[PDB]
């Protein structure tokens, strides 16, 4: 068994999709051990607003944070080919926002390359009765040595047709493992006037396993 915390600070060069120029995401979870692999539970506070509100021209303004609670069970198919299934639930301001079942598959090469997909349904639980969307996170990671891992993660929303590029460098030292990440977000998103909501985030973060 093991617990873990992770989180970050995000500086946004536009900030409208987040509603603020500075946000934070924090997450804490625990992996119970069974023989299939691990069963992990977790909670994520997403979208905490720190910086100047962005309220005009498509900005989201003063939001309430995205609270996720989630469980996931992973399975090793081979020693290097694994899959998982799990469920996330999205709450916000005391309400159910979405049902989010998810599935994952990935493969880990000996040379330090690893590949993985997460496909996550976004099923509205609110009255807006919105169309179900599907988030895909496709990630390639390179652990060049035991001291640094590099990663590119593509975020794609199938229906909205929006795309995020995420590039990360992680100092995988013993103990707290800080990381820097550049996110090029919201490619495809537009405001009412048809202007681009593209956002660049500089992200400073850290993870710790115990």
Ligand X SMILES: CCCCCCCCOCCOCCOCCOCCO
Which of 63, 64, 119, 200 contacts ligand X by CB under 6 A? 200
Contact positions with a copy of itself (CB under 8 A) in 125-144: none
Asked if 122 touches ligand X (CB under 6 A), the answer is no
DSSP, residue by residue, 89-135: EEEETTEEEEEEEEEEEEEE-TTSEEEEEEEEEEEE-STT-PPPEEE
* Of 47 and 205, CB closest to ligand X: 205
Contact positions with ligand X (CB under 6 A) in 33-72: 40-45, 50-51, 67-72
Q: End-to-end CA distance of the chain, in Å?
A: 9
199 binds, among a copy of itself, ligand X, Na ion, none (CB under 5 to 8 A by kind): none
Nearest distance from residue 198's CB to Na ion, in Å? 23
* Of 62 and 76, CB closest to Na ion: 62
Go through 163-198 and write b for each residue having 16 or more CB atoms within 10 A of its CB, e for each that does not. bbebebebeeeeeebebebebebbbebeeeeeeebb
Contact positions with a copy of itself (CB under 8 A) in 54-73: 62, 64-65, 67
* Of 47 and 205, CB closest to Na ion: 47
Nearest distance from residue 65's CB to a copy of itself, in Å? 6
**Footprint of ligand X on this chain (CB under 6 A)?**
5, 7-9, 11-13, 22, 24, 26-29, 40-45, 50-51, 67-72, 85, 87, 89, 91, 94, 96, 99, 101, 104-107, 111, 113, 115-118, 123, 137-140, 142, 147-148, 150-152, 154, 156, 167, 169, 171, 178-180, 182, 200-202, 205-206
């Amino acid at each position: 068994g093991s617990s873990y915390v992770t989180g970050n600070i995000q500086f946004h060069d536009d900030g409208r999709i987040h509603g603020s120029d500075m946000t934070s995401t924090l997450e804490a979870g625990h992996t119970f051990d069974n023989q299939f692999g691990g069963f992990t539970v977790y909670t994520e506070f997403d979208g905490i607003q720190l910086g100047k509100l962005e309220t005009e021209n498509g900005g989201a303004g003063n939001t309430t944070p995205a609270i996720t609670v989630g469980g996931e069970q992973a399975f090793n198919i081979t020693d290097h080919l694994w899959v998982a299934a799990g469920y996330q639930h999205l709450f916000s301001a005391g309400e159910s926002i979405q049902y989010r079942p998810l599935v994952k598959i990935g493969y880990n090469f000996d040379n330090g390359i690893s590949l993985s997909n997460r496909t996550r349904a976004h099923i509205d639980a609110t009255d807006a009765d919105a169309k179900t969307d599907y988030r895909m996170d496709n990630r390639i990671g390179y652990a060049m040595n035991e001291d640094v891992t590099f990663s590119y993660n593509n975020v794609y929303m199938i229906e909205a047709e929006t795309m995020d590029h995420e590039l990360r460098a992680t100092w995988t030292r013993q103990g707290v493992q800080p990381y820097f990440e550049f996110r090029s977000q919201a490619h495809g998103a537009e405001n009412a006037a048809g202007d681009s909501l593209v956002n660049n985030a500089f992200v400073f973060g850290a993870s710790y396993g115990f």
